[PDB]
Ligand binder design. Structure first.
Ligand SMILES: [Mn+2]
Ligand SMILES: [Mn+2]
Lengths: 180, 178
């Protein structure tokens, strides 16, 4: 079912924003076709981390991951960083060839930095380009502000809804900002 | 002549693809207004590096920076990474206030990562947004292949940035609905 024009959408949670200090603790993927129709929803994986890494989180991250239950999911998880990378790759290979899809979503430069450091095989599976919806948001803010303000950002508390809202944002810009 | 809506376009050359293990060897900038009209071209700067760093480049970078003349320019340069950062900031400060402009160009996540490691004062001068022309390039390839062929695309740094601006102008005129 591989297709070189299918898009890989990703969402990550981390202990913090610095790849040298921090690690990935949750990952999720969705594969769409070129026209943003969902083909398959990938595994949502809580990645195990030892207690000292969990205690090393700052105040905002200890509170947010604690209150969301992710911290307890991470503590209980029996899936290592490398195993989660392999689990995600096994899913994506059924749908997208290697080096075909850019990383798609929002704030994905930060995602690429974390994948490069902690999941280099998955990072290398993407095309080197980023498909970041926020480029369209920035251009719309300048050239068509009404399109940016008419986007209704739904709930993104959980990982698949988070990705789906990024797909919906791009879909919004295709319907109202892109000439076709 | 500062304007918070002006755009900083940047293009770097590096010794390799790893922002943490490799280094910057060339930089250039151009400032446009928010409607992509060029206001000023910044300095094009070859950044000195020790010979072992040049000798250590992989096969692709050894050939490409060799035949472009950059390898010789890096050897002959007396401008350090920090001096090149300061020269570029002195140009940009005349045109854009701090934190106002996104980083603008093709696949500029790569450039921002190198700046963050090697020229953090300059990296910090940008807004946190990335304006990535190659996001539109990929979208146009899949949704409007005719628009990607309409644009005819340069080893000189300022030519490279001019072509990134012209590529965005092409999408604004033939891909985006205003
Ligand atoms: Mn924002
Ligand atoms: Mn091209």
């Amino acid at each position: 079912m591989q297709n070189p024009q299918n898009l890989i959408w990703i969402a990550l949670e981390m202990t913090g924003l610095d790849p040298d200090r921090d690690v990935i603790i949750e990952m999720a993927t969705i594969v769409t076709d070129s026209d943003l129709n969902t083909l398959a929803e990938g595994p949502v994986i809580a990645i195990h981390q030892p207690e000292e890494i969990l205690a090393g989180m700052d105040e905002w991250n200890t509170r947010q991951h604690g209150q969301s239950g992710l911290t307890q999911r991470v503590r209980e998880s029996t899936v290592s960083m490398a195993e989660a990378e392999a689990q995600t790759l096994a899913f994506l290979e059924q749908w997208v060839p290697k080096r075909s899809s850019p990383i798609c979503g929002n704030s994905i430069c930060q995602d690429r930095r974390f994948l490069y450091r902690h999941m280099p095989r998955l990072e290398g599976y993407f095309h080197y380009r980023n498909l970041d919806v926020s480029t369209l948001k920035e251009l719309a803010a300048r050239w068509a502000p009404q399109v940016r303000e008419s986007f209704k950002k739904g709930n993104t508390h959980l990982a698949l809804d988070d990705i789906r809202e990024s797909i919906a944002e791009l879909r919004h810009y295709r319907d109202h900002f892109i000439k076709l």
